[PDB]
């Protein structure tokens, strides 16, 4: 194990004040640090903590080639779509995981942060696209979507749609329509050179045994 | 696919010479035929064409056990009441749609067919009833209505009333007081073979490739 000691900045991801819209999701790169995941999997905060290709309790034993933390807000009934092989407006047009995903998907209800008494409309999702999004592709365009045969010429009209729609979040919504903050931790467990490692304590180097 | 024949008899519904009164609305059952709904929807003359749970282009891609076509004349400003969850003398006493309706409502102005210079009084509607209709219930009864305490004994009087009233369609009426022909299409899928379908398109043949 390498002899660095600075802990990874997960507080800057999970305790950020504003999250992104799911069409315009954030990505943070995590590198050259000690990743204690126990602060995450021993927390009582999270309504979802699903790991893929790894188990949560094993994470403090591992080293990771690179780590990415991706952040956005969605509805409670859309957290289902943040998994490998899924489909629907979020998986198809906003945020796609690869089928071979290695990492963890973490989500908590944020109806006390991301809802306002008149409705909060700051958060959006893409409703229309010509084709499905590739794994970890991002699309922040606002071209008018052409649903039919005639060109739109950058103007909404018959079969010509603005591609993004807002989530209106009220504190009174049923839980499947409340806002959830989602973090996706993504990493490669292949034995390439690794700058992120769990809190493991190294021994001396013993030879001829 | 085999070439397109046995088209559904929508011309017998939409181009009938005389329509029903709304209290005595006609029902036609459509089965065992090819239904090109886009030939209806692309036709001119429809002042209303509203679909619930379906779209006309998607109906050409769907199959049903039966289609029901219900038809009648109403006043032009009563067409508002031919929808899920509506109230008023048409929706309440004459023709009721369910709240879970799957179907299309089509209406057009028929002033040149259904008005007379002497006034046309051949079309009637139910003015008085004990209680509101069930969805797709019909009531052709002519028993004298009682608003008072005495039994009317089949005789009109002080507050004993004939339950049906005529429209008086004059060609000079304002457009809300003119006659409108209405067709409601209900799509039915059972535990049975889907005998009604949209037309299947064919390419050319390509031999030697």
């Amino acid at each position, epitope marked *: 194990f390498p002899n660095i000691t600075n802990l990874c900045p997960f507080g800057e991801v999970f305790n950020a004040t504003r999250f992104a819209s799911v069409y315009a999701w954030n990505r943070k790169r995590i590198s050259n640090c000690v990743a204690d995941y126990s602060v995450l999997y021993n927390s009582a905060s999270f309504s979802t903590f699903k790991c893929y290709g790894v188990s949560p309790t094993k994470l403090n034993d591992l080293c990771f080639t690179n780590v990415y933390a991706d952040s956005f807000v969605i509805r409670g009934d859309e957290v289902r779509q943040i998994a490998p092989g899924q489909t629907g407006k979020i998986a198809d047009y906003n945020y796609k995981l690869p089928d071979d995903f290695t990492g963890c998907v973490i989500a908590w209800n944020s109806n006390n942060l991301d809802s306002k008494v008149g409705g909060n409309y700051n958060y959006l999702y893409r409703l229309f696209r010509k084709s499905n999004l590739k794994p970890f592709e991002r699309d922040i365009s*606002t071209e008018i979507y052409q649903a039919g045969s005639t060109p739109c010429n950058g103007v909404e009209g018959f079969n010509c749609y603005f591609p*993004l729609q807002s989530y209106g979040f009220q504190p009174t919504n049923g839980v499947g329509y409340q806002p959830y903050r989602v973090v996706v931790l993504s990493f490669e467990l292949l034995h390439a050179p690794a700058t992120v490692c769990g809190p493991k304590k190294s021994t001396n180097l013993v030879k001829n045994k | 696919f085999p070439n397109i024949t046995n088209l559904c008899p929508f011309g017998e519904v939409f181009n009938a010479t005389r329509f029903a009164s709304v209290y005595a609305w006609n029902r036609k059952r459509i089965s065992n035929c090819v239904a090109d709904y886009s030939v209806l929807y692309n036709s001119a003359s429809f002042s209303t064409f509203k679909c619930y749970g379906v779209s006309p282009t998607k109906l050409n891609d769907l199959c049903f056990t039966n289609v029901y076509a219900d038809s009648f004349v109403i006043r032009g400003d009563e067409v508002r009441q031919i929808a899920p969850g509506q109230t008023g003398k048409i929706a309440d006493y004459n023709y009721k749609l369910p709240d879970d309706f799957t179907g299309c409502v089509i209406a057009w102005n028929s002033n040149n067919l259904d008005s007379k210079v002497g006034g046309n009084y051949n079309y009637l509607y139910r003015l008085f009833r004990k209680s509101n209709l069930k969805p797709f219930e019909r009531d052709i009864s002519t028993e004298i209505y009682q608003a008072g305490s005495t039994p009317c004994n089949g005789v009109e009087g002080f507050n004993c009333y004939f339950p049906l009233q005529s429209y008086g369609f004059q060609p000079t009426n304002g457009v809300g007081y003119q006659p409108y022909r209405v067709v409601v299409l209900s799509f039915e899928l059972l535990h049975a073979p889907a005998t009604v379908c949209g037309p299947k398109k064919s390419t050319n043949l390509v031999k030697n490739k």
Partner: antibody, heavy 117, light 108 residues
């Protein structure tokens, strides 16, 4: 919030430039419109411009005579008006118009242009 | 160019009445028809979009219907804040056109 500026009295055959400043929404994402209302009359659309300025369209009453423009760095919409007639006397409004997708609409407070000798 | 006719040019009503106003297009526009309210010296406020969809924060007493050429706006139980001028607008093609709005001008 939308705020129109640049109105007032003008001589017939003259020119004017309207401007409209946007605050509290992503102006850069949207088509924007000019709409007008002559004193005691109904609403009348004037012109539209795309989110990036690539396409522009006009009413036939104003085509050639008026030009619509924007810059998204300044959150600002403009209407250059030339060959002003007495016919052009109206409150002019700066607006985001809804079509078929749910969103928040915005209309400015409107600015009055008066054209007479 | 699509012409829109608004049928009652002015209405008179009292608080708690139902009110209806109608708009009639010169060609089919599917469901592409907005409704606006305007009060004297203020900008228009959008009530209904598509032809039936209630705009964010608008009172549930307003409703729209129509798909084709004939459209209606209703006010289910009229209130002291509803006495205003009402405009339809087609969203279907350019130029964007408005109906000559209905006044609702007796307050009682």
């Amino acid at each position: 919030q939308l705020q129109e500026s640049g109105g007032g009295l003008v001589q017939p055959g003259g020119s004017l430039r309207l401007s409209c400043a946007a605050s509290g929404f992503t102006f850069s994402s949207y088509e924007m419109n000019w709409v007008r209302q002559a004193p005691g009359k109904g609403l009348e659309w004037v012109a539209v411009i795309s989110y990036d300025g690539s396409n522009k369209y006009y009413a036939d009453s104003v085509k050639g005579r008026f030009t619509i423009s924007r810059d998204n760095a300044k959150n600002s919409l403009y209407l250059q008006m030339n060959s002003l007639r007495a016919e052009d006397t109206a409150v002019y409004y700066c607006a985001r118009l809804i079509t078929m997708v749910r969103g928040e609409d915005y209309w400015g407070q409107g600015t009055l242009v008066t054209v007479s000798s | 160019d699509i012409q829109l006719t608004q049928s009652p040019s002015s209405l008179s009503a009292s608080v708690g009445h139902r009110v209806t106003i109608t708009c009639r297009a010169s060609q089919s526009i599917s469901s592409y028809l907005n409704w606006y309210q305007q009060k004297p010296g203020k900008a228009p406020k959008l009530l209904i979009y598509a032809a039936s969809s209630l705009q964010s924060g608008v009172p549930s007493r307003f409703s729209g219907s129509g798909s084709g050429t004939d459209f209606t706006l209703t006010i289910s139980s009229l209130q002291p804040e509803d006495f205003a001028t009402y405009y339809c607008q087609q969203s279907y093609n350019l130029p964007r056109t408005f109906g000559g709005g209905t006044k609702l001008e007796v307050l009682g």
